Design a protein around this ligand. Sequence first.
Ligand SMILES: [Ca+2]
Ligand code: NA
Length: 309
Amino acid sequence: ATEVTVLEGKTMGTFWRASIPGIDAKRSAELKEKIQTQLDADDQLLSTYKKDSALMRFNDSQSLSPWPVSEAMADIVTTSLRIGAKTDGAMDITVGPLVNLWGFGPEQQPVQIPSQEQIDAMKAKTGLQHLTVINQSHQQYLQKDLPDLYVDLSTVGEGYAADHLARLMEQEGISRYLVSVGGALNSRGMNGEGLPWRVAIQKPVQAVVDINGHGISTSGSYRNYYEGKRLSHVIDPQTGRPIEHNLVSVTVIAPTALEADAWDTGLMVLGPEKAKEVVRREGLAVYMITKEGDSFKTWMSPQFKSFLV
Ligand SMILES: [Ca+2]
Ligand code: NA
């Protein structure tokens, strides 16, 4: 039994954690500095709450020509656009202005219920089709065909950050770790007890999965979870209205946390029936919780079940 060192801090409006076994204390001290520095840089790349972030500079710009961005920005957006297509638009990184219209952004509250005409007009300003990624040998770009398109990567940033943290671990010669950024995690190697890192999914008891060599993410709709007296604040990108189905939690295991974090949001928006079709077609490892009145129901794909201990 070797000691597991735990490092923790703040990033992206949430928290990160890194567990590492058998690492001495001057190393884990330095590693925290590097982790926080990297996560600060990722936050500065992606945040919609930082006014001079790379993403916000693009958002504020009125240009319809290619806008230079980093490799990570290009790849995050490519992944998001494609999983958006594969979830029939349900995962939409351009939906922000519809969310703001409702006042359902996390740093805002009171606004009138918008009219459908208002919603439909606002939809003209959103859509996965409006965004393009351009890759070349030493450069890459985003390009929007609408000046007032607004890109929000908050639904995939944790997954990216978690994958980027694993890259950092490798860089620093760390072979065994459990790293998390918000709801996204990557697992590799054995813990202090010589066993796979414990990753639990809540089943209303904890069901345990071994996701060694994989990543995981969960997305939910919680305004109903704890009662249904209220609406979801999850907006369907296609209707511009709150989702109406009973799916309250989706957990995805994938080779990368970014993929998991992209899928879980899309599947959540789709609801049980449509999500299951996507999960079947794409061969995804997914765990779903639905709330019927007062009762909770769960569903796991076969691919998810492979991860159960
Ligand atoms: Ca997500
Ligand atoms: Na549109």
